[PDB]
Every structure is written in structure tokens, then in C-alpha cells.
Amino acid sequence: APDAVFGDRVRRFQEFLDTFTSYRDSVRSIQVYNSNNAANYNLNILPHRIIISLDDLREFDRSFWSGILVEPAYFIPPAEKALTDLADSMDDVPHPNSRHPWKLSFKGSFGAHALSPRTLTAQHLNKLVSVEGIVTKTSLVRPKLIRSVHYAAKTGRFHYRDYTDATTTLTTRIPTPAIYPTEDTEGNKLTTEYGYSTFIDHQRITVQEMPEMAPAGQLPRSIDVILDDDLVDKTKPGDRVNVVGVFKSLGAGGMNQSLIGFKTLILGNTVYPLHARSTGVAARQMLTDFDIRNINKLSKKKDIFDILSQSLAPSIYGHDHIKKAILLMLMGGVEKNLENGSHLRGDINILMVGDPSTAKSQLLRFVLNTASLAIATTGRGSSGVGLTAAVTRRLEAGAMVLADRGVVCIDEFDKMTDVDRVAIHEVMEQQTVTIAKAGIHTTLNARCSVIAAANPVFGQYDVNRDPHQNIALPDSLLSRFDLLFVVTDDINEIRDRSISEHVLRTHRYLPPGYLEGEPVRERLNLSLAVDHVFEKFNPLLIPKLVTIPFLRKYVQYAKERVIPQLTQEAINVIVKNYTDLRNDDNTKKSPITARTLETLIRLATAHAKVRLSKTVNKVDAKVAANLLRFALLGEDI
Amino acid sequence: PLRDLDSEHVSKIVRLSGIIISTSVLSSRATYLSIMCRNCRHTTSITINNFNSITGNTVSLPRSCLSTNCGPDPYIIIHESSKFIDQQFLKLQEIPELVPVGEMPRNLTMTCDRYLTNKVIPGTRVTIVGIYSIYNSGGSGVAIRTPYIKILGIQSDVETSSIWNSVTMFTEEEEEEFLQLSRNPKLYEILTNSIAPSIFGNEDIKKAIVCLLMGGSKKILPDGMRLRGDINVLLLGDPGTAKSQLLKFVEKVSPIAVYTSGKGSSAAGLTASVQRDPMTREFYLEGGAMVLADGGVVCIDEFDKMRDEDRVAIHEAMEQQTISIAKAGITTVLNSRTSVLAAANPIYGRYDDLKSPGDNIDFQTTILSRFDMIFIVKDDHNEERDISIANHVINIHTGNANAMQNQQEENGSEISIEKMKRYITYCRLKCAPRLSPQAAEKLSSNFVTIRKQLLINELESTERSSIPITIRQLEAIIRITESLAKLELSPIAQERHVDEAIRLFQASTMDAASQDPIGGL
Amino acid sequence: SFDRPEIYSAPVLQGESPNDDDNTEIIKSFKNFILEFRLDSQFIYRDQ
Amino acid sequence: SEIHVRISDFPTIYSLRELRESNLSSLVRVTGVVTRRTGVFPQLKYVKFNCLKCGSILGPFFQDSNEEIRISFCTNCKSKGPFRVNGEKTVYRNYQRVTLQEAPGTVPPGRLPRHREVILLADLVDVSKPGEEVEVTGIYKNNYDNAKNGFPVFATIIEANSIKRREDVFSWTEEEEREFRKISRDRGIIDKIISSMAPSIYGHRDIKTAVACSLFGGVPKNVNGKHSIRGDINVLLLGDPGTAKSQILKYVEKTAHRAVFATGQGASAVGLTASVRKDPITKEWTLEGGALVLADKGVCLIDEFDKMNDQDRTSIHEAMEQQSISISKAGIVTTLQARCSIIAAANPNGGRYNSTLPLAQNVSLTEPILSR
Ligand SMILES: Nc1ncnc2c1ncn2[C@@H]1O[C@H](COP(=O)(O)OP(=O)(O)OP(O)(O)=S)[C@@H](O)[C@H]1O
Ligand SMILES: Nc1ncnc2c1ncn2[C@@H]1O[C@H](COP(=O)(O)OP(=O)(O)OP(O)(O)=S)[C@@H](O)[C@H]1O
Ligand SMILES: Nc1ncnc2c1ncn2[C@@H]1O[C@H](COP(=O)(O)OP(=O)(O)O)[C@@H](O)[C@H]1O
Ligand SMILES: [Mg+2]
Ligand SMILES: [Mg+2]
Ligand SMILES: [Mg+2]
Ligand SMILES: [Zn+2]
Ligand SMILES: [Zn+2]
């Protein structure tokens, strides 16, 4: 039976949708997208879901906003009905072959409802809450029968029955346990018609307080979240997540005479995978047309490589070719997948062996902070079980499996066991992890670029000795590292005063919105995995330095929209340089193998990607070989 | 006592002490629920304002329609119009100190509700006022019942602190007292003399302790390049030189502090220990001194005797103040913004004046680079000092002279550990000084001078010095200068702070480098 | 989400001796009485 | 409410292996060592049942150890429906189960010791610790509750009337206090106490002096809450085999109040290390303080201190340095108190003491532990 208050709220939300035109634009775009590939194929179908900004709702109608936040069961169904009515009103051109219920998702500032699994108590029940946590368990995506269609052969007629549970609606119904129809009303045997029955995907994930904010030494708190038909498979275990949903109570909690307390869970409305450092979530960024224009504008510059090289770690003094190599690894080459099935690696590995305090770990931490997807590990702090996969009858991804299509920053690389070393041997060239353990023969993808830091045998790189004795690493392992940089802390007066002036200038830095003696606050930077190009603060005083967010945008653009093709004019340089490096006797820091030809190719491709060029020209090969010759010998030609 | 609860205490208010060993997850209990009949639409409400503390549920839904046939239990709960409260199950236990040698320690189930939930954590020593009550569920028995406690109040004692158990809120007069104490021109001496007044003859070490407790100012560069502000101090010395006692005092006086060994405590870890959950088998941070003491200091005794699994972890958590856990399924960078005060013994029992500080120590030489200031506490066998130390130590032992003279000296020349701890908290939470440009230039000149002299000493020799002056050492002198400036709540570190930090760096890691045959002239 | 399993039978063998009191023997004898009874050379009950 | 009668000096003393069906429902007097005790639980004695139809509290109905009682008759409304025991108005009595196992000395050769379950009711609870040899007088009866055995077989219990130790201890009276204060005034008392220790251990007079000093101990001192000094005397006994070192440890366990005996390897009565351990039968976790925690204000006697695990070594070292045990396990983060005096017994490194070598390299343990 119709409710006057329900209709009043429906028309109020219709007024809200009319006021903010972005929601008709979103619904219209979704409908035209669905119709266009429906007619095209007689890709994927976008869900009937709209992101609603709670700030705009508060601006429009504060009580509707407070009603949704505090009494969602009475305000969300009317708003969803209004959205569905609006969508069916604009649906003048129906999809080929009210109706099509549209769901709502919420975003914005939740205030006191933005909680965690620890702070989510029983006085938040029946409220729209945003819970931030870590996904620890993801159940199987199971179909749920919401409508069963049967066939009666004697009458030749198709019947159906709709099913309802306590979690499909925000309000409580009268429970109607309608049985599965095994026969008609008048005795005819029914045959279930699979493919005409309706099954809805259902998942139940567990969100636990994030380790970065959970109290140390205390047992963590968890909360159940239920996802239905479009939020399933939106996250994976170990993901940082922000789930917006209604904190519901279900069952009777032992009152109904046939539990210790009422069964509580979150009916998920929105799932946002969050980006935290050293996690398995990549960093999607929004690239406006202005950002792309600036990226192309800077790519037109000749010295853009240098501009990108110095802007990586201005705080670190020097380490300029190391920064060039780090930028090239951030871009990386393009992997080759030949038709027969073979794989050519397109990821660049870097090793930095050096004396104490030459900033190898700060250069690792910077890469961890700025990379799209980076996992930080330490030698012997993570084993092969912790680096590669692990069998739990089920597999748990390790450091280098979560970092697939990403970067692995390994500090204290020398303090790594040989059992880990063999797994690392497999991961670096073939980019795969073969388990073959306890009846689980699986080949996980570990297409990751490894950057590592190491110390010499005696703790100080002796220039009198040779590198092979100063490294104490297997030669086969050192071959996998595309670029091996030996950094030595030479005491020279010019660079001594220059590095000290830099260190002090960096220490004498103030944020734009801070006082002289105000302790700088620090948050954990839980970015959402979806305004000037250059940097005001320049530790060096000189070319221009771009901001780290803009550098990340540039790296993302070049990494996702540029796939350079090798050219003969680059091949001549690459082949000549490889032949010289193989045959010339120079007492190289690292050996020269066919892997050296491919690090030449990969670095040339990466530098071509830096310039946004779709073809690797001669200059790219020359600069790649230049960096390689520096890395092998120390030349400055 | 928990073992003295007979059957005469049943359904009565009892006060009993113990330790919490378990805190269950909060469960929702209906305090007001709307109900509606199934084969009707009869709306009713059941209010639960009392009897919320019981293992069972004394009040259930009606077995009849209450509108007077509909059937048995025809009511369903309208969950969007009902009200719920929190409940928690705690597990009290008699303290393990006062337990019979050969018997199980006795535990007792407790239930709390509403505002008595999430008040204590496991391991907290508490005083529980409650109702000693009964529920039916301690195995084979007739007419026996399971006792428990309905908690009416929890009185936690002074327990372990954390970065979550921090006030950060000063009463108005307390800020004024600290601020008056801050202009005190002899603040450096009053705070130095308050560092273990009982330990004798370690003024430079006490100044280093003061600087470590203050620490430098942190920087968050636009690159995300974090520069560390905490200070790490190492004390290599002869046995019996007070190194541990100054670690224990630093543990006592710091707001948040953890005192451990190289191998850890009896069962407590030392770094981030990710472990499977006791019931849900889900990865969680079991503990570790470096994550438990986040935001404060850790006093690592016997730093030389430490495993390699803890080696790399502490090496990471001193420069980047972050422990990078990466296991099969869990990967996280845990904040470990902790100052490290380490005490170590020479490989031979006494410090060998002949040999360098390196090769006279068990651990790696380059670990000496990670520490900001290294104090070689040699023992001098001169009798003047022996007699003075013996007289001081006797004054400690039933002489009662040091206690009285410290209470007398507290009036204008010493500060109590509570007041000094709160002052440390205020200084860390309110001040973060910078360097004046002239101070920075003179720091650079000083560092260049030290490094050039090290180069001169190393050029003529063959091997390298055990204690090297690296860029980390420059960044440390900066931290000491900023700590000295923050001592007096100075927003800017002037020349005098730089000079004092320079003197401290000559006292330690430069006098420590003096014994180096290559680091010396 | 499956249907109702069916149960069905079929005669294969002679079972135990038809007993005279069995409801199925009684039904058979009534059926024979209806079909075979003759009054003045007329199947009166069949025709009726 | 009532007086309980404790029958004592029963003439017929049985053994747990001698109990047969002829002793059922009769009064027996067995003897044995207590091996387990199951807490103290309330048991219904005067049951008042609440009527769920009226809200009426029916009067006290005496319940005994035979079986639970039930009420089906109301008075105000004469309902026979659900009747619930009212816990608030019901009266309870103490109940405890004690496992009584035959003393191993009295068991005939080749036979395994036999056990019974003794039920202690409302006055005998918590009077017989495990390991105590007691004489239980009681009623030998059948615990009624058959198909696992294939036979109608019943378990038996002994409902104890009176329980007593067959053969407080450290308590003193005013006359005994005066005797102490007078015997102290005599000269040469220190030597008398030294000679009193270990009266079946020949010589070893320095060992006995050290044992007496540790048994009496010093006094802990805090200057202002800023400097702390332990008031316990840790004594090491470095000896060759057959030097009676174990006997001077068992004598200290004899004479000391709050004395806990542990070993580096062997009988693991106590583990020397605090741990949160989940008991596999009772389903509940327990925080076991180490042997140094149990003897918080007494003495910890370690045998085989030369040979210990790294865990035990770390526990002992850090409880001697800080006088506390820090544990962060299973969500429990706490620092227990271990202000114990440690008496350790060790064997030299190799088998015999070498006078030519210093003590540091004559035994496995190293500088830090020996200093304490
Ligand atoms: N200068 C001093 N003033 C006062 N007490 C002192 C002094 N030096 C040592 N002590 C006392 O000596 C005792 C033992 O000193 P510790 O603090 O254990 O020495 P330590 O050098 O840390 O020993 P290690 O290296 O840990 S074995 C303590 O009770 C101190 O109070
Ligand atoms: N001075 C002594 N007086 C009396 N009995 C002694 C003496 N010295 C040794 N014994 C006896 O020698 C035996 C040695 O047994 P323990 O006291 O356990 O020796 P122990 O020193 O612990 O031997 P290890 O080192 O553990 S093999 C016992 O039977 C003692 O009674
Ligand atoms: N060349 C350099 N330029 C700038 N800062 C440096 C340089 N070398 C060392 N540092 C500083 O030294 C400190 C420690 O460096 P770190 O990365 O921990 O050294 P390591 O690579 O030996 O572990 C950091 O604060 C870093 O900024
Ligand atoms: Mg490093
Ligand atoms: Mg010590
Ligand atoms: Mg022995
Ligand atoms: Zn009804
Ligand atoms: Zn009644």
C-alpha cells in the first residue's frame, strides 16, 4: 500500500536530482553506453548505480541528508525509487531487447559516521556508516536465487516464483518462506528452467582494522560486509577498503524461542579500494585535459629526461644517474609475448651496492612512496614464503606476487638467504612463481621490477679490491639486475660542503601552512584508487623541478598510453654498444651476457617512453647505452 | 580474592582484583525493540532498561499475539526502529604471582555493558566491582552452576602506556607551570641534573639523555622524503658503568618508553611481530618493542646480542622510523617513530684501549654509523673516583642522604619524574624548532672540518676508521641542536644551541673516534 | 535448485500367491462380477 | 542454616584398589594423594522457583547431591507451565571435585595407581592442594548418568564427609614471636642458622652461609622512584658431579616460603617463562607466569642452570636485570613482577672444575648472567 511519506521523500529526492544536473548526465551516459554496445553486439555493461555526493545533498536539503545518514532504511529506498523513475523517464530510447531498479552509492564527508571496525559500536546500528579497514576474508561469489522459473509440460506453461531474504531490503518485511515450487497448483510436475531463473551475485567480505591504525599488541576488530550483484569482486584480501553501507542488525539474537546477541553486519552500498604504501592496490589518478596538455608540453622539451631525473629526489644530493635509472624503471620497457608462448621481460631491475649513508634506503623509500604500485621488503625480514607465494589447500600471495605489474623495494639485499635467492632468481627473469607444493601446481604472475640496496662485505667499498670480491653475491643473481650501481662515500671538500649545505637547506624547510615552531602533522595518506606543474621548494640552487604528484601523472600517462616500437636506427647503436661491451676489456663492475643486450633494449624503450615517442630513435639507444656504460664502468661520455 | 569466592557471595556485590586476559568483541543487545505479529499487524514495543548483564536472555519475544489465533511466537522484530547497546565479555584471572605452584590459575567470566565496554585491554591489572551471579551451561556434576560477574564498575590501575593512551591535553595551569619552567635560564642544568641523580659522574651521558628525550624536529619534505627527528644514542662500556641503570631511568622518565634486551623480553618481541589470530587465524601485529613504543623511546640493553631477524628491522626503523612488514598475505609499513637508546658491552669484558672501538665489539662495525652519538664509558681505576663512587653508592644504600638531598634539590634545582615526563610531552607536542641560517653555515663548516681531518687521518694509513663521520652524523648534530632549542621552547635554534651540540658531538663519537688508531691523529 | 524426484514401479515377476482377502483380489472379483454376470443372457450390469 | 558433621577416626581404612560394589552406598575411609582440583562451583541447596505465569517465587525446596529438583504445582495460579529456578533468591553451597590417586609408594609392583573422584561440599572446598597425601572419609556411591562398554557399567564417586591430611606452617604466635625475639639475642646465632641449613649435607659451610643469606635476603630500595636496587641475593652453586648441589636445592624448597623449583632440562613442572597458553581440554586461555613470577616474593631454585634454552636464558636474564617479566602474546601486553631471589645449581663446562682456568670459561653461561 502506498505511503504518503514515501512519496513525499521520493518527490524531494526527485527535486534534488533535478537541481544537480550531474546525476541526469551520469544516468544518461550510463544508459547510452549500455544501449550502444547492446546494439553493437546485438565489452561490458555498466551497472545501474549512481555515486551521490552527500555534501551536495546537505547543501540542497539538510534533513534529507541527515535522514539518509541517520535513518537510511526510510530515506534510501525513496531516493532509489526517485532515481529509477528519473532513469525510466529519460529512457526514451530503450536498450535493445519501475523497471530496471537503480541503486545508490554515497560519497563525501560522513562526520561521526566515518568509522573503523573497532569504533563501530551498537549505537551505530541502522545508520549509514563509512568503515575503513583491511580486507582479510573474501567469500566465494555465490549466486542467490531471486526468481525461479519453472515449466509445466502437461499444460505447457511457464510459472515463476520470487524469493526474498532479510538482507535484500533495508526495511524489515514480514518473512514469507515460500517453498521451491516442485509442482503446479493442480498437481502437474514442474521442471526447473535454468537460464530463465534469476540469480544475483552475492559476496560476504570481512573488513578488519588496518594495521597502520590498529592498536599495537591488541586483537583486531572485524566487521562483515555483504555485496550484491555489482560490488562483488571489487576487492581482494589484503586490500585497504572503505565500505559505505547500512550497519544492519539481523535475526532475533536469541529472543525468538527455537544466539548470545544480535547478528550485525554492513549492507554494502559502496566499495572504494584505497591506496596505501606497500599494499597491493595501485594508484589510479585522474588526468584532466590540462594535465595531459602540460605533460605533452613538457615532453616536447629536449631535456625533459633531466627535468624528470632531478625532480625525483631533490632532497638527495647527486645520485643523478641513479635517479635516471629509477625513472626509467618507473617507465620500464615493453614486455614481449611471442605467439609460441615465450616471454621477454620488459621490467628494469636496479641494484645499489654502497657505503653506509649514501642514501640507498632514502632512494628506496622515495620509490616506495612515489611508485604507482610498490611493496617494501627487507632482507631476511621476508623469506621466500614472504616474498613468493605460500600454501595455506589455498594460496596466499607473497611480496613479489602482490607487486605484480609494480615495484619491489628490497633493502638489505645482501642479508638474504640462498633459499630466498633461488626464488628471486626465478622471479627476476621469467617473471613467474611456480609453487608445485602440497598438490598445488600453480604458476603465479610476478611481473615486477626489483630495486634493491646492499652493503659490501667489509661494510666499506674498498677501491683497491675488485667488485666481485666486494659484492659477495652470486654472479647469476647479479646478471638479472639490469643496472648495478656501486656508490662510494669519497670525502672530497667540494661535495662535502655542497652535500652539507643541501642537507641543511632541506632541514630548513617550512610547509606553506605552518608556523616557525609548529610540529608538522603527518597522516597515513589513504589515497582513493580511482595544481601547478613545477615545484616551489627547490633544495638545489639549475633546471626546473616538477612536483611529485605531477611526476606521477606523467609516469602514468607515459606508462599507459605509450608503447614504443624499436627501430633499425636504434638497433644499430644497440648492437654496436653490446658488441663493444662484450668484447672490450675494461674490468667491468658486472658481467656482460645476452641479458645486457636486453637491458640495452629495455632502457632504450623506457627512454622512448619518457619522451612520449611511439618509436625508439637513435638518441634513446645512445642514452640507454650511456647510462649502462656509466653503470658498468663509471664513464661520463 | 578470586580464590576466596564461596557460594555466600552469589547475587551480591563483590570487589575482586585481578588481571584481564581476554576482551571479546562487542555484541549488540536489544534495549528497546519494536515487534509486529506475523498473521496480524499488531505493533508492540519491548523495553529492556535493566537485566542487560546476563549470559542468557531473560526477556524474550512474546509467545502469543498479545492482541487478545496466530500461532506460537508470532512476533518479528522491526530492526530499523529498534535500539541496541554494546556488551563485552572479559576474562579476569588471579594474578599469576599469587598462584599455587602446581595448580591452574583460576579465571572468571565477566560481562559489561554500555559505558563499561572498551574500558580495559587484556593484560590490564584491574579492580572489578560487580555482582557475583550464576548462569547455567565445571564438567560432570549435579545441580552445579557456572559463576560469573556482572560488572558494575572497572578501576584500572597505572598500566602500560601507548601512542593511543596519550592525553595531549594539558590543564590550563599545567601549561603555565611548564612555560614558567621553560624560561628558567638554568633549564639545561636542572634537566641534566634530573637525569638519574643517583648515577654518578656521567654528565655528558645525561646531556645526551636530555637531548634524546627532547629529540630534533621532524621534516616532511614536499617529495614525501621524511627526515627523522628522533635521536639514537649508543653506550659502549665496561661492565658496572651504569649503562643499564641509565636505560631503566630513561624508561621510567619517558612518557612512552619500552625497556628490552637484544633478544627481547621473556615472551615479548623486539620489532613488529605479525602473528596469526588466536581464534580467527587472521594476521595481526602481536607486538614488539619498536611498535609498542612508537612515539617514544626504546632502551635496548645488550644490543650486541641480537638476532638477524631483528637486525635488519631495527636498522630500517632507526633511519626511516618504519618497519616494512611483508609476509604471505599481509604487507604494511608500520610507523616506528621511536628513539633508540642502546647499551652494549665490549667483546672482551673490559674495553681494550689498544684496539679500535670496532673489532672490540661483537656486532658489525657499520652499525656505529646508524647511532647519532656513541659514548665509550671506560672505567677509570683512579682511587679518588673509587672513594667518591663508594661514598655515593653507600649514601644510596640506607644512608638516606641522596633521597633527602634530592628532595631538597627539587626546590629549584631538580624536577620530579612525573613533572619532567609531562614537560617532555609538552615540549614534544608544542615545539619543533628550525635552524638560523648562520647556525646552519657554522654547522656545515664544522662538519667539513671534521670530515677533512678524517680524510687526512685516513690518507696516510691503510685501513678505514672504525667510527666514520658520515652524512648521517651531520644530520645528527642538527637533531641535537634542534633538541637543545626545543628544551627551552625556543622556536629557533641559535648559535649557543649549535655550540652545545658541537660540544656533545666532540664528547661522544669524536672522543670515541679518538681511541681509533685510524680515527686519531 | 532441483526438482522433485519421481517414484514409479513396473511388474516383472509373480509375487506371493494372490490371497483371497487381498483388496486387489477383491477388486478383481468385483470387476469380474460386473463384466461377466449374466441375467437372461444379458450383461445387465455392464449395460447398466 | 545447618551444622555439618565430620566423622573422624573411622576404623576401616580402605585402598582405592580395594573398593568394590560391596562398599557402595556405605561409608569408606580411603587414603591417597590429591592430583587435580576443579575450582569451586555453586550448587543449588534451597531452590526458589519463579512462576512465569504469575511472577510468583515458590518457597525454598531443599535440593541435595542426588539429582536436580523440579516443581510443577503453583499456588497463586496453579500453573504447571515453564517454572524457572530464581538464581537471585536461590541459596547455593560450595562444590568441588578432587581427583584422589593412590600414593605411588603403596601401589603393589607391576600395578598402575588407581584414582577416584571425591566430591567436597560447602565446607571442605580448597583444603587439599595437589600433591598432598590425605585421608578421605566419605560415602562411596554411584555417579548416575553404559553403551561405550557394552555393559550397564556405572562410574563411582566418594562424597567426602571429612577430609584431613595424614602426615599455617610458617605462621607464628605471640609466644613463638617472643621465643624468636629471645633466641635472636643470643650471640653466635648466625653460625647456628648456618649450621641448621642442610642437616644431611656434609660440610659445604660456605654454601650453607650463602643459602642462609639468600633465604633471609636483603631489602629492596627505591631512592625517589628514580633509582631502584634489588633486595635479593642470587646465589650460584658451581660444582662437580656428586657435590650435593641438588640436595641444597631441595632443602631450600623444604624451608623457604614461596619457593618454586625449576630445571634447565627435565621435569617441566614450571617452565621458567611466562606464556599465554590455550588449555586444550577446558577451551580457555591461561596466562602462566614463569617460575620467576610464581616466586614473586620468594626464591626460585634452578637446577641445571648450565644447560638452558635460549628462551629460558633470556627470561632469567631479563628478570634478574629488571625484576619483571614482559609478555606481549595473544593480545595480552603486560609486565608481571618477578622480584625473586635466584639460587642456581650448575655443572662445570666439561665435567670437572679447572682451577687453572677462570670461572668465566669454566662454565657455559657468560659474563652478563654471572655478574647478576
Ligand atoms: N656511577 C655510578 N653511580 C651509581 N651507581 C652506579 C654507578 N655505576 C654503577 N652503579 C651501580 O652498579 C649496579 C650495576 O650497574 P649496571 O647498571 O648493571 O651496569 P652496566 O654497565 O649496565 O652493566 P652490564 O653492562 O649491563 S653487565 C647498579 O645497581 C648501579 O646502581
Ligand atoms: N657433602 C655431601 N654430604 C652428603 N651427601 C653427599 C655429599 N656430596 C655428595 N653427596 C651425595 O652424593 C649424591 C649426589 O647427588 P646430588 O646431590 O644430586 O649431586 P649433584 O651435584 O646434583 O650431581 P649432578 O652434578 O647433578 S650429576 C647424593 O646421593 C648425595 O647425597
Ligand atoms: N648524498 C646524499 N644526499 C643527501 N642526503 C644524504 C646523502 N647521503 C646520505 N644522506 C642522508 O643520510 C641519511 C641516512 O641515509 P640512508 O638512506 O639511511 O643511508 P643508507 O643508504 O646507507 O642506509 C638520510 O637522512 C639522508 O638524507
Ligand atoms: Mg640502508
Ligand atoms: Mg645491565
Ligand atoms: Mg643434580
Ligand atoms: Zn496476531
Ligand atoms: Zn503461577
Q: What is the CATH number of the domain that holds A75?
A: 3.30.1640.10
DSSP state of A482: S
Q: Which cell is A569 given? A: 636506427
Q: Are the beta carbons of B126 and B120 closer than 8 angstroms?
A: yes
SS3 state at A84 = helix
CA distance D285 to B107: 9
Q: Are the beta carbons of B299 and B249 closer than 8 angstroms?
A: no
Q: Which residue, among D343, D371, D367, D339, has the nearest Cα to D228 in the 3D structure?
A: D339
Instruction: Tell me, rounded to whole angstroms, the distance of Cα B8 from its chain centroid.
Output: 43
With cell 581404612, the residue in question is D13
CA distance B187 to B185: 5
Q: Which cell is C4 given? A: 522433485
Q: Are residues A100 and A173 in the same domain?
A: no
Q: Are the beta carbons of A328 and A346 closer than 8 angstroms?
A: no
CA of D253 to the centre of ligand 6 (A): 14
B245 in contact with ligand 1, CB cutoff 6 A: yes
- Which phi and psi (to 5°) does residue B261 adopt? -100, 180
Tell whether residue D242 is among the known ligand binding residues. Answer: yes
Indicate yes or no: CB of C1 within 8 angstroms of CB of A197.
Answer: yes
Contacts 24+ apart (CB under 8 A), A299-304: A299/A554, A299/A558, A299/A610, A299/A611, A299/A612, A303/A543, A304/A610, A304/A611
Q: Which cell is A456 given? A: 659490501
SS3 state at B465 = coil
Q: Which residue, among B294, B472, B220, B471, has the nearest Cα to A369 in the 3D structure?
A: B220
Chain D's closest residue to B263, CA to CA, is: D314
Distances B481 to A539, B18, B511, C21, D266 between C-alpha atoms, Å: 21, 47, 19, 116, 56
Which residues, 6+ apart, have CB-to-CB distance to A351 below 8 Å? A413, A451, A452, A453, A454, A478, A481, A483, A484, A485
Give the residues across from A443 on adjacent strands.
Answer: A434
Q: Which cell is A462 given? A: 674498498
Instruction: Tell me, rounded to whole angstroms, the distance of Cα A493 from its chain centroid.
Output: 45
Q: Tell me which residue has its CA closest to atom 20 in ligand 3.
A: A357
Indicate yes or no: CB of C6 within 8 angstroms of CB of A189.
Answer: yes
CA distance A154 to A143: 30
Q: Are residues A8 and A109 in the same domain?
A: yes
Q: Are the beta carbons of A414 and A454 closer than 8 angstroms?
A: yes
**Cα-Cα end-to-end distance for chain C:** 51
Which residues, 6+ apart, have CB-to-CB distance to C27 below 8 Å? none
Q: Are strands B43-47 and A49-53 parallel, antiparallel or unpaired?
A: unpaired
CA distance D7 to C48: 99
CA of B400 to the centre of ligand 5 (A): 24
Burial class (CB in 10 A: 0-12, 13-18, 19+), B4: exposed
Q: Is D52 on the interface with B (CB under 8 A)?
A: no
Q: Are strands D285-288 and D341-346 parallel, antiparallel or unpaired?
A: unpaired
CA distance A395 to A393: 7
Q: Please, what sign has the CA dihedral across residues A320, A325, A331, A334?
A: positive
Q: Which of A137, A316, A500 sits opposite B448 (nearest CB)?
A: A500
Q: Are residues A33 and A92 in the same domain?
A: yes
CA distance B267 to D305: 19
Q: Do chains A and D touch (3 or more CB pairs under 8 A)?
A: yes
Closest chain C C-alpha to A235 CA, distance in angstroms: 29
Range list of β-strands (E), B5-145: 12-23, 27-37, 43-47, 75-93, 107-113, 125-135
SS3 state at D255 = helix
CA distance B215 to B428: 8
CA of D329 to the centre of ligand 4 (A): 30
Q: Are the beta carbons of D247 and D200 closer than 8 angstroms?
A: yes
Q: Are residues A120 and A244 in the same domain?
A: yes
Q: Which cell is D343 given? A: 639460587
- Tally Cβ neighbours within 10 Å of residue D297: 14
Q: Which atom of ligand 1 is nearest to the CA of D372?
A: 27
Q: Are residues A99 and A44 in the same domain?
A: yes
Indicate yes or no: CB of D131 within 8 angstroms of CB of B102.
Answer: yes
DSSP letter string, A194-212: TTTSEEEEEEEEEEE--TT
> For a substitution probing ligand 2, which of D205, D236, D243, D352 has the most ligand atoms within 8 Å of its CB?
D243
Chain B's closest residue to D275, CA to CA, is: B267
CA distance A594 to A590: 13
Which residues, 6+ apart, have CB-to-CB distance to D132 below 8 Å? D33, D34, D165
Q: Which fold has domain B172-513?
A: Rossmann fold (3.40.50)
Distances B298 to B254, B255, B262, B337, B373 between C-alpha atoms, Å: 10, 11, 11, 10, 16
Q: Are strands D91-101 and D26-47 parallel, antiparallel or unpaired?
A: antiparallel
Q: Give residues 282 to 311 of D whose Cβ lies within 8 Å of A.
A: none
CA of D264 to the centre of ligand 2 (A): 18
Q: In the PDB record, what is the listed experimental method? A: cryo-EM
DSSP state of D349: S
CA distance A602 to A628: 11
Q: Are residues A138 and A218 in the same domain?
A: yes
Q: Which residues surround ligand 7, an ion (CB under 5 A)?
A: B 37, 40, 65, 70
Q: Are residues A188 and A266 in the same domain?
A: no
CA distance A101 to A88: 9
Closest chain A C-alpha to C25 CA, distance in angstroms: 30
CA distance B125 to B157: 6
Q: Are strands B75-93 and B27-37 parallel, antiparallel or unpaired?
A: antiparallel
Q: Are the beta carbons of B274 and B330 closer than 8 angstroms?
A: yes
Distances B448 to A461, B444, B510 between C-alpha atoms, Å: 22, 6, 14
A373 contact residues in B (CB cutoff 8 A): none
CA-only gyration radius of chain B, Å: 30
Q: Are residues A217 and A228 in the same domain?
A: yes
Q: Tell me which residue has its CA closest to atom 24 in ligand 2.
A: D241
D306 in contact with ligand 2, CB cutoff 6 A: no
Q: Are the beta carbons of B377 and B235 closer than 8 angstroms?
A: yes
Distances D13 to B63, B439, D27, D107 between C-alpha atoms, Å: 58, 94, 10, 15
Alpha helices by DSSP H, A300-411: 304-310, 320-331, 360-370, 384-387, 399-402
Half-sphere exposure (Cβ direction) of A137: Cα atoms closer than 13 Å: 13
What type of residue is A304? I
Q: Are the beta carbons of A379 and A415 closer than 8 angstroms?
A: yes
Tell me which residue range forms the domain holding A65. Answer: 2-113
Q: Are residues A271 and A163 in the same domain?
A: no
CA distance D321 to D318: 5
Q: Are residues A134 and A246 in the same domain?
A: yes
Q: Are the beta carbons of D143 and D156 closer than 8 angstroms?
A: yes
Instruction: Tell me, rounded to whole angstroms, the distance of Cα A501 from its chain centroid.
Output: 38
Alpha helices by DSSP H, B183-258: 187-192, 203-214, 243-253
